[PDB]
Design a protein around this ligand. Structure first.
Ligand SMILES: [Mg+2]
Ligand SMILES: [Mg+2]
Ligand SMILES: [Mg+2]
Ligand SMILES: [Mg+2]
Ligand SMILES: [Mg+2]
Ligand SMILES: [Mg+2]
Ligand SMILES: [Mg+2]
Ligand SMILES: [Mg+2]
Ligand SMILES: [Mg+2]
Ligand SMILES: [Mg+2]
Ligand SMILES: [Mg+2]
Ligand SMILES: [Mg+2]
Ligand SMILES: [Mg+2]
Ligand SMILES: [Mg+2]
Ligand SMILES: [Mg+2]
Ligand SMILES: [Mg+2]
Ligand SMILES: [Mg+2]
Ligand SMILES: [Mg+2]
Ligand SMILES: [Mg+2]
Ligand SMILES: [Mg+2]
Ligand SMILES: [Mg+2]
Ligand SMILES: [Mg+2]
Ligand SMILES: [Mg+2]
Ligand SMILES: [Mg+2]
Ligand SMILES: [Mg+2]
Ligand SMILES: [Mg+2]
Ligand SMILES: [Mg+2]
Ligand SMILES: [Mg+2]
Ligand SMILES: [Mg+2]
Ligand SMILES: [Mg+2]
Ligand SMILES: [Mg+2]
Ligand SMILES: [Mg+2]
Ligand SMILES: [Mg+2]
Ligand SMILES: [Mg+2]
Ligand SMILES: [Mg+2]
Ligand SMILES: [Mg+2]
Ligand SMILES: [Mg+2]
Ligand SMILES: [Mg+2]
Ligand SMILES: [Mg+2]
Ligand SMILES: [Mg+2]
Ligand SMILES: [Mg+2]
Ligand SMILES: [Mg+2]
Ligand SMILES: [Mg+2]
Ligand SMILES: [Mg+2]
Ligand SMILES: [Mg+2]
Ligand SMILES: [Mg+2]
Ligand SMILES: [Mg+2]
Ligand SMILES: [Mg+2]
Ligand SMILES: [Mg+2]
Ligand SMILES: [Mg+2]
Ligand SMILES: [Mg+2]
Ligand SMILES: [Mg+2]
Ligand SMILES: [Mg+2]
Ligand SMILES: [Mg+2]
Ligand SMILES: [Mg+2]
Ligand SMILES: [Mg+2]
Ligand SMILES: [Mg+2]
Ligand SMILES: [Mg+2]
Ligand SMILES: [Mg+2]
Ligand SMILES: [Mg+2]
Ligand SMILES: [Mg+2]
Ligand SMILES: [Mg+2]
Ligand SMILES: [Mg+2]
Ligand SMILES: [Mg+2]
Ligand SMILES: [Mg+2]
Ligand SMILES: [Mg+2]
Ligand SMILES: [Mg+2]
Ligand SMILES: [Mg+2]
Ligand SMILES: [Mg+2]
Ligand SMILES: [Mg+2]
Ligand SMILES: [Mg+2]
Ligand SMILES: [Mg+2]
Ligand SMILES: [Mg+2]
Ligand SMILES: [Mg+2]
Ligand SMILES: [Mg+2]
Ligand SMILES: [Mg+2]
Ligand SMILES: [Mg+2]
Ligand SMILES: [Mg+2]
Ligand SMILES: [Mg+2]
Ligand SMILES: [Mg+2]
Ligand SMILES: [Mg+2]
Ligand SMILES: [Mg+2]
Ligand SMILES: [Mg+2]
Ligand SMILES: [Mg+2]
Ligand SMILES: [Mg+2]
Ligand SMILES: [Mg+2]
Ligand SMILES: [Mg+2]
Ligand SMILES: [Mg+2]
Ligand SMILES: [Mg+2]
Ligand SMILES: [Mg+2]
Ligand SMILES: [Mg+2]
Ligand SMILES: [Mg+2]
Ligand SMILES: [Mg+2]
Ligand SMILES: [Mg+2]
Ligand SMILES: [Mg+2]
Ligand SMILES: [Mg+2]
Ligand SMILES: [Mg+2]
Ligand SMILES: [Mg+2]
Ligand SMILES: [Mg+2]
Ligand SMILES: [Mg+2]
Ligand SMILES: [Mg+2]
Ligand SMILES: [Mg+2]
Ligand SMILES: [Mg+2]
Ligand SMILES: [Mg+2]
Ligand SMILES: [Mg+2]
Ligand SMILES: [Mg+2]
Ligand SMILES: [Mg+2]
Ligand SMILES: [Mg+2]
Ligand SMILES: [Mg+2]
Ligand SMILES: [Mg+2]
Ligand SMILES: [Mg+2]
Ligand SMILES: [Mg+2]
Ligand SMILES: [Mg+2]
Ligand SMILES: [Mg+2]
Ligand SMILES: [Mg+2]
Ligand SMILES: [Mg+2]
Ligand SMILES: [Mg+2]
Ligand SMILES: [Mg+2]
Ligand SMILES: [Mg+2]
Ligand SMILES: [Mg+2]
Ligand SMILES: [Mg+2]
Ligand SMILES: [Mg+2]
Ligand SMILES: [Mg+2]
Ligand SMILES: [Mg+2]
Ligand SMILES: [Mg+2]
Ligand SMILES: [Mg+2]
Ligand SMILES: [Mg+2]
Ligand SMILES: [Mg+2]
Ligand SMILES: [Mg+2]
Ligand SMILES: [Mg+2]
Ligand SMILES: [Mg+2]
Ligand SMILES: [Mg+2]
Ligand SMILES: [Mg+2]
Ligand SMILES: [Mg+2]
Ligand SMILES: [Mg+2]
Ligand SMILES: [Mg+2]
Ligand SMILES: [Mg+2]
Ligand SMILES: [Mg+2]
Ligand SMILES: [Mg+2]
Ligand SMILES: [Mg+2]
Ligand SMILES: [Mg+2]
Ligand SMILES: [Mg+2]
Ligand SMILES: [Mg+2]
Ligand SMILES: [Mg+2]
Ligand SMILES: [Mg+2]
Ligand SMILES: [Mg+2]
Ligand SMILES: [Mg+2]
Ligand SMILES: [Mg+2]
Ligand SMILES: [Mg+2]
Ligand SMILES: [Mg+2]
Ligand SMILES: [Mg+2]
Ligand SMILES: [Mg+2]
Ligand SMILES: [Mg+2]
Ligand SMILES: [Mg+2]
Ligand SMILES: [Mg+2]
Ligand SMILES: [Mg+2]
Ligand SMILES: [Mg+2]
Ligand SMILES: [Mg+2]
Ligand SMILES: [Mg+2]
Ligand SMILES: [Mg+2]
Ligand SMILES: [Mg+2]
Ligand SMILES: [Mg+2]
Ligand SMILES: [Mg+2]
Ligand SMILES: [Mg+2]
Ligand SMILES: [Mg+2]
Ligand SMILES: [Mg+2]
Ligand SMILES: [Mg+2]
Ligand SMILES: [Mg+2]
Ligand SMILES: [Mg+2]
Ligand SMILES: [Mg+2]
Ligand SMILES: [Zn+2]
Lengths: 112, 101, 59, 140, 151, 116
RNA sequence: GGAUGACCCCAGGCGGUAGGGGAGCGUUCCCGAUGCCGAUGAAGGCCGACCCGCGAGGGCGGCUGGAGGUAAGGGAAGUGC
RNA sequence: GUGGAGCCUGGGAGUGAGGGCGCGAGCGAUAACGUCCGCGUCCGAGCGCGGGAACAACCGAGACCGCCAGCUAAGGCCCCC
RNA sequence: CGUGAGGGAAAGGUGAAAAGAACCCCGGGAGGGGAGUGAAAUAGAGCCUGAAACCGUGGGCUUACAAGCAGUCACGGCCCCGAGGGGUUGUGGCGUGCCUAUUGAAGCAUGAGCCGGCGACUCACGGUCGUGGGCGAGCUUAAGCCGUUGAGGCGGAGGC
């Protein structure tokens, strides 16, 4: 049995969040909660919301138990980029990509 | 008992019970052929000079086939020369029946 | 200067090998001896306001 | 019929008294033994030669004026860093290096040849520590 | 094409490839090289060939037994079921396609809607239609004009 | 009528790409690099099936030579003696004999010394 | 040889840039077609260590797809990166 | 002397920057990886193969495909090989 | 975009039907998870198909004494599907990218970041040869006219 949550179109760059996601892959729900809580990265606010949402789904829709939950899989895919103009010297216009993430957390139960 | 036989410009060490692919022989599937013997070894040793007069190896042809395709490709740089050929070498499958020493 | 510039595109292999040092180390945490909540060592506990066995702070 | 390939074999240890032998003419034989080419099941992509122990390397011989004129060479990578050390001096300081260096150049370059060279065990003076191996003495 | 003739950017020193106008066929949106233009595919095939051709085609059906001449068409007075009756009686069950040639308008109307029937006036007899169909059926009056045309 | 590229080019590229399975980086990933890699690959294969014929015979010879010297002669002598004796067993076979069948190999050695 | 490009047999030629010549493959469209294949699944996509072909290619199978496709023989080109 | 010989009529070209080497000269300095002719060759187009450490034109030799068979060529046969 | 004359884009498709997802759950929201609709929901509106480059998670094999146009030939190890095949690659052998231009390029000479799509020998009229047919001291019609409405015929002026 598995419970999942996907946060789509989060306005933060995939490479930045993955770094935070990698910190909790395989951890117990409790450990992951601590880690995010004292991870000094913006990404942590977002991963924490997907975790907690998956956890809720586990308990409320899928008949799993909070105390047995662990991050079975987590990954960050890239959404569509926001393209923005960054004006440079000499008439040049650069294009900044303000990138976008779809964050997935999947919880399982660590039985016995 | 083993024999060293010669078929298809090539030489093989055969023992009875052996299946062997050789160059294509002109003999119906199910036929039986006599291969020449160049050397017999095992219990007794007899040495052809080059073949041994009395001996022959008896083979039943199980069938004839085509080898898995080998692509033969040719390329020369800077000259737009390219060639691609598919090659399947024909062969015969033999079961080695007996060594008539 | 004369505007140096990459000579070849970096391979996926190379790029990712540069990143072999990029993994975050998780926050170091110890239990608060008063309320058992996990926290950074050497900090006043933000769950209960306790540090050095006493109440330091309203939380 | 495919050509025979040997399964792993137990390597044979061998012992050679270098005393009075001609450096180069000994080295070629040591090389053959290390490649394993005296063996009828020689296979070029596995180490399956002998381990070779040599003793009395300090008593190797050399013809002509080579003790004075043969120069060994080492490059450090630094400006002016080419050291030239002559046979005489090399024998007087690291005698086992003379045979070692000659055999090394007669082994293949590559991962295997490097490994083959580790199977050579050269000693100045009559003794060696490979008693446990009970190396078979060879006249060559 | 609709674009202007301005050279889009200077010949040299831009770091880009040289171009002229964006109508050039090398641009998405540009013109097409050697595309089709309005055309006349017709040509005057020799008259004798058409003639010899007509005749051979009718000849070919004749040699097969598939050419049938008829005097008149019974009761066919412009109704499909009428032609259908007559046809059955004439050996045309509709298992074989028929090029029906007659000047009787009343007969063409009756037969035209049948999937297996192509109708023509005799002035229209032509080899594609004969060759497209399995059986050739003609009025004598039709057969008469065809004989005058292959003369 | 118009005949747009359509389906045709993707299909040629997949063909080549599929042959390039296994190659490093863009060599299995980019049609262009794959195709380059393949030109080289086909020529090597051709060249190398030629030299496999040589690679093996060199091996047979090193093996025969080892087996000869156990009986006190060299490869060159052994081959001349075989010739003179009229023995035509080839080196692929002489080699299998030398390893799998020492008694037979010995006898051929004998005929070879004797034949000179 | 047999009569005819049916296939067998013997022999010989077969490195190639510019370039000449020959034979084919595939794309879009037309006749074939008021037909035929098709929801028991069109085209298209993704796989395949299978079959045919020297090759370009063509089959066949599984998955995807969900409404089209189109033979033998011919015809015509916005036809192959 | 039956050869991818020759000759005749016609269709289609491409080429009209060559280069190394050997021999014969001129020019140059009995210089040049020089230059300019002649006869030949090879590379060009044989940057396919063996030898020459490596190397278009030096030596060996003209690659239709396959073989875990045999004989040689130049060059080699102490080890690398 | 340009003072202006003037330049001048991109951008189509849920489903048969909105039945366009009530209500609950996490969340500030966005987003998701259930529930529900539908033949189908990786048809959920950022909607048919959904290739490729590109980014990731999971697994098999492999890699920290090794020298490399990245392959190829050989053998052996491991993993997989079941005298065989497939994947992987340790060691050994061999090995100077593609295209262009050149006497000659791996060349330290040009061009190309990669991928998809667009992208260059045609058409008319005349000519010249060849070729498939028709007629042959003859061959052939043009414009037009009649017919048809994807039907053909007439038309001899004229041309060779
Ligand atoms: Mg931190
Ligand atoms: Mg909860
Ligand atoms: Mg400004
Ligand atoms: Mg950029
Ligand atoms: Mg950017
Ligand atoms: Mg065969
Ligand atoms: Mg074979
Ligand atoms: Mg090239
Ligand atoms: Mg090359
Ligand atoms: Mg080229
Ligand atoms: Mg060239
Ligand atoms: Mg080429
Ligand atoms: Mg400067
Ligand atoms: Mg600088
Ligand atoms: Mg400055
Ligand atoms: Mg700079
Ligand atoms: Mg640079
Ligand atoms: Mg990259
Ligand atoms: Mg990666
Ligand atoms: Mg790097
Ligand atoms: Mg504590
Ligand atoms: Mg020895
Ligand atoms: Mg070898
Ligand atoms: Mg020392
Ligand atoms: Mg080497
Ligand atoms: Mg305009
Ligand atoms: Mg215009
Ligand atoms: Mg306009
Ligand atoms: Mg203009
Ligand atoms: Mg203008
Ligand atoms: Mg202008
Ligand atoms: Mg310029
Ligand atoms: Mg640039
Ligand atoms: Mg440009
Ligand atoms: Mg540019
Ligand atoms: Mg320009
Ligand atoms: Mg232009
Ligand atoms: Mg212009
Ligand atoms: Mg324009
Ligand atoms: Mg247009
Ligand atoms: Mg347009
Ligand atoms: Mg165009
Ligand atoms: Mg044009
Ligand atoms: Mg144009
Ligand atoms: Mg045109
Ligand atoms: Mg018109
Ligand atoms: Mg025309
Ligand atoms: Mg006309
Ligand atoms: Mg009808
Ligand atoms: Mg019909
Ligand atoms: Mg179309
Ligand atoms: Mg195109
Ligand atoms: Mg297209
Ligand atoms: Mg395509
Ligand atoms: Mg292509
Ligand atoms: Mg495709
Ligand atoms: Mg294709
Ligand atoms: Mg690989
Ligand atoms: Mg790759
Ligand atoms: Mg890559
Ligand atoms: Mg890729
Ligand atoms: Mg290829
Ligand atoms: Mg080959
Ligand atoms: Mg070769
Ligand atoms: Mg000896
Ligand atoms: Mg001989
Ligand atoms: Mg022999
Ligand atoms: Mg040719
Ligand atoms: Mg021809
Ligand atoms: Mg042609
Ligand atoms: Mg066909
Ligand atoms: Mg095509
Ligand atoms: Mg075609
Ligand atoms: Mg059309
Ligand atoms: Mg129709
Ligand atoms: Mg239809
Ligand atoms: Mg049906
Ligand atoms: Mg259905
Ligand atoms: Mg289906
Ligand atoms: Mg199609
Ligand atoms: Mg289509
Ligand atoms: Mg296919
Ligand atoms: Mg399909
Ligand atoms: Mg329809
Ligand atoms: Mg069709
Ligand atoms: Mg057709
Ligand atoms: Mg037709
Ligand atoms: Mg075009
Ligand atoms: Mg002739
Ligand atoms: Mg000729
Ligand atoms: Mg000629
Ligand atoms: Mg032409
Ligand atoms: Mg010209
Ligand atoms: Mg020219
Ligand atoms: Mg000129
Ligand atoms: Mg000139
Ligand atoms: Mg010149
Ligand atoms: Mg010349
Ligand atoms: Mg000249
Ligand atoms: Mg030179
Ligand atoms: Mg000359
Ligand atoms: Mg001379
Ligand atoms: Mg001279
Ligand atoms: Mg002169
Ligand atoms: Mg001088
Ligand atoms: Mg010169
Ligand atoms: Mg000179
Ligand atoms: Mg001179
Ligand atoms: Mg010359
Ligand atoms: Mg040239
Ligand atoms: Mg040559
Ligand atoms: Mg030549
Ligand atoms: Mg070449
Ligand atoms: Mg050479
Ligand atoms: Mg060489
Ligand atoms: Mg060499
Ligand atoms: Mg050469
Ligand atoms: Mg030839
Ligand atoms: Mg020999
Ligand atoms: Mg010689
Ligand atoms: Mg040598
Ligand atoms: Mg060495
Ligand atoms: Mg202005
Ligand atoms: Mg304005
Ligand atoms: Mg303008
Ligand atoms: Mg545009
Ligand atoms: Mg719709
Ligand atoms: Mg609609
Ligand atoms: Mg429907
Ligand atoms: Mg809320
Ligand atoms: Mg919502
Ligand atoms: Mg959720
Ligand atoms: Mg929902
Ligand atoms: Mg339902
Ligand atoms: Mg259904
Ligand atoms: Mg789907
Ligand atoms: Mg769908
Ligand atoms: Mg989209
Ligand atoms: Mg649809
Ligand atoms: Mg879609
Ligand atoms: Mg999609
Ligand atoms: Mg994809
Ligand atoms: Mg992975
Ligand atoms: Mg080392
Ligand atoms: Mg290692
Ligand atoms: Mg290798
Ligand atoms: Mg081997
Ligand atoms: Mg395997
Ligand atoms: Mg393997
Ligand atoms: Mg080479
Ligand atoms: Mg290279
Ligand atoms: Mg080179
Ligand atoms: Mg290319
Ligand atoms: Mg270029
Ligand atoms: Mg140039
Ligand atoms: Mg130049
Ligand atoms: Mg130049
Ligand atoms: Mg290079
Ligand atoms: Mg370079
Ligand atoms: Mg330059
Ligand atoms: Mg370059
Ligand atoms: Mg230039
Ligand atoms: Mg660029
Ligand atoms: Mg790329
Ligand atoms: Mg493209
Ligand atoms: Mg033309
Ligand atoms: Mg013409
Ligand atoms: Mg004509
Ligand atoms: Mg005519
Ligand atoms: Mg005229
Ligand atoms: Zn506390």
């Amino acid at each position: 049995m598995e419970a999942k949550a996907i946060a789509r179109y989060v306005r933060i760059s995939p490479r930045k969040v993955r770094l935070v996601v990698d910190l909790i892959r395989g951890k117990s729900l409790e450990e992951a909660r601590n880690i995010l809580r004292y991870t000094n990265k913006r990404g942590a606010y977002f991963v924490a919301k997907v975790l907690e949402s998956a956890a809720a789904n586990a308990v409320n829709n899928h008949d799993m138990l909070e105390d047995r939950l662990y991050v079975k899989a987590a990954y960050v895919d890239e959404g569509p980029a926001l393209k923005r103009v960054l004006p440079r010297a000499r008439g040049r216009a650069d294009i900044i990509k303000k990138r976008t993430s779809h964050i997935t957390v999947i919880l399982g139960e660590k039985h016995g | 008992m083993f024999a060293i036989v010669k078929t298809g410009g090539k030489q093989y060490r055969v023992e009875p019970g052996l299946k062997l692919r050789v160059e294509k022989l002109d003999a119906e599937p199910g036929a039986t052929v006599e291969l020449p013997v160049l050397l017999l070894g095992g219990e007794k040793t007899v040495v052809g000079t080059p073949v041994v007069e009395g001996a022959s190896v008896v083979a039943e042809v199980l069938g004839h086939g085509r080898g898995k395709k080998i692509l033969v490709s040719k390329f020369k740089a800077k000259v737009q020369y390219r060639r691609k050929k598919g090659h399947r070498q024909p062969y015969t499958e033999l079961l080695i029946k007996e060594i008539r020493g | 200067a004369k505007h140096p510039v990459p000579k070849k595109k970096t391979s996926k292999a190379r790029r990712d090998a540069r990143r072999s040092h990029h993994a975050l180390t998780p926050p170091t945490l110890v239990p608060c001896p008063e309320c058992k909540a996990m926290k950074p060592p050497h900090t006043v506990c933000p769950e209960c306001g306790y540090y050095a066995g006493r109440k330091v702070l309203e939380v | 019929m495919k050509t025979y390939v040997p399964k792993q074999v137990e390597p044979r240890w061998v012992l050679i008294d270098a005393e009075g032998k001609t450096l180069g003419r000994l080295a070629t034989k040591i090389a053959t033994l290390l490649r394993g080419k005296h063996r009828p099941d020689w296979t070029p992509n596995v180490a399956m030669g002998d381990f070779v122990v040599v003793v009395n390397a300090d008593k190797i011989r050399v013809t002509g004026k080579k003790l004075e004129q043969k120069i060994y060479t080492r490059y450090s990578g630094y400006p002016g860093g080419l050291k030239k050390i002559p046979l005489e001096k090399m024998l007087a300081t690291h005698p086992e290096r003379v045979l070692e260096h000659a055999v090394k150049g007669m082994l293949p370059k590559g991962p295997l040849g490097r490994r083959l060279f580790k199977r050579l065990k050269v000693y100045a003076g009559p003794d060696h520590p490979h008693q446990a191996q009970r190396p078979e003495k060879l006249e060559v | 094409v609709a674009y202007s003739g301005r050279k889009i950017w200077p010949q040299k020193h831009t770091g880009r490839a040289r171009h002229g106008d964006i109508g050039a066929p090398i641009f998405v949106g540009g013109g097409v090289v050697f595309g089709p233009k309005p055309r006349d595919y017709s040509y005057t095939l020799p008259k004798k060939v058409r003639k010899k051709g007509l005749a051979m085609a009718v000849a070919d059906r004749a040699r097969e037994g598939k050419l049938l001449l008829v005097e008149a068409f019974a009761g066919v007075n412009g109704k499909t079921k009428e032609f259908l009756a007559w046809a059955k009686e004439a050996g045309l069950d509709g298992s074989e396609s028929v090029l029906l040639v007659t000047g009787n308008e009343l007969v063409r109307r009756a037969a035209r809607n049948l999937p297996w029937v192509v109708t023509l006036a005799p002035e229209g007899l032509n080899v594609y239609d004969i060759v497209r169909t399995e059986r050739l059926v003609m009025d004598l009056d039709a057969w008469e004009v065809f004989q005058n045309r292959i003369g | 009528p118009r005949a747009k590229t359509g389906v045709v080019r993707r299909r040629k590229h997949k063909k080549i790409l599929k042959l390039a399975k296994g190659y490093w980086g863009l060599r299995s990933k980019s049609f262009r690099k794959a195709r380059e890699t393949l030109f080289a690959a086909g020529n090597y294969a051709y060249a190398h099936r030629k030299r496999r014929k040589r690679d093996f015979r060199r091996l047979w010879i090193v093996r025969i030579n080892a087996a000869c010297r156990q009986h006190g002669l060299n490869y060159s002598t052994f081959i001349h003696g075989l010739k003179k004796a009229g023995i035509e067993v080839d080196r692929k076979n002489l080699a299998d004999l030398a390893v799998r069948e020492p008694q037979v190999f010995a006898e051929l050695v004998e005929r070879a010394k004797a034949a000179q």
